[PDB]
């Protein structure tokens, strides 16, 4: 089926400290592979999946150094925004970023993402044409015009269409261990439970009160909902939907 | 592989 | 302030059977700002050694995390998750129901 990569980056400013806390978290087909964290001991892009270990110290200097840039970028930006909105001093603010790319089952580029939130509110976003911006509010217009009258979009486009695809095409080839080999739900009634599935997309029914899908810590997911009445399970990995009652 | 930002907001 | 109240679910990695080692999960979601304290309790006593996992956010920008620790379920004891977060005056405590 289809495939994706995403980096989630958060910077949080703090009263007193002149450097914000910074976390970046990498995801492949919706599953974590790399992470950086500013607070930590002495900080770098630790791997959070075993298949990423075959990348050699060399790849980590590259990425770890990249994360150094982003802190710089997020600090300055944190302070540009304070003025844009007349936020006075001593108060806690948050800037968030999302970027990455979708691939379809043929491995070609479906679409890129590059977007931003301030205080948890949409701020500015790259349109699906990788070439123009949607700005949420009047502050974001400043950013927009800076980014127009400076060609950022193409830079991101170049990362999105090229690099993003190239490396994901590769991570895929490096770790089908807990990726391409998807597993599927074991259901039962005690309310029917689906357990053990991957990916997390699933639907449940009763035929004659939704629990949200939830990590079980080991990489699989679970859901539930509560003779006539019978439960059906729908999933990416079922070679035919499941039907049951018992008890 | 993460992306690098250029121009600030 | 821009603030959102965390949703909480407490549950086991595996369906529980007496005296049979397992993991307990406390999944916390939909909250903002991202700072938060999560505790796991055995009979109102702070369980030692809890791993924090995730801390990223979902496409609606709101934050999620998973807390977890090792445990041998018994039916002589209570288990809960206790959360503290600027959006709530007093800590919230959700109790484990083994059928859920």
Residue numbers in the entry:
A (entry chain A): 1 to 190, 202 to 219, 229 to 246, 255 to 275
B (entry chain C): 1 to 9
C (entry chain B): 0 to 99
Study authors write:
The wt NP366–374 peptide binds to H-2Db in an extended conformation where the P2-Ser, P5-Asn and P9-Met are the anchor residues, P3-Asp is a semi-anchor (partially buried/partially exposed), and P4-Glu, P6-Met, P7-Glu and P8-Thr are solvent exposed and available for contact by the TCR.
However, the mutation of P3-Asn to Ala leads to a loss of 35 contacts between the peptide and the MHC molecule. Interestingly, the Asn3 Ala mutation abolishes contacts between the P3 residue of the peptide with His155 and the Tyr156 of the MHC and eliminates one hydrogen bond between the P3-AsnNδ2 and the P4-GluO. The loss of inter-residue bonding between 3N and 4E within the NPN3A peptide may also be important for TCR recognition as it changes the characteristics of the wt DbNP366 epitope (defined as type III constraint) into an unconstrained DbNPN3A epitope. This suggests that the NPN3A mutation does not modify the stability of the pMHC-I complex when compared to the cognate epitope.
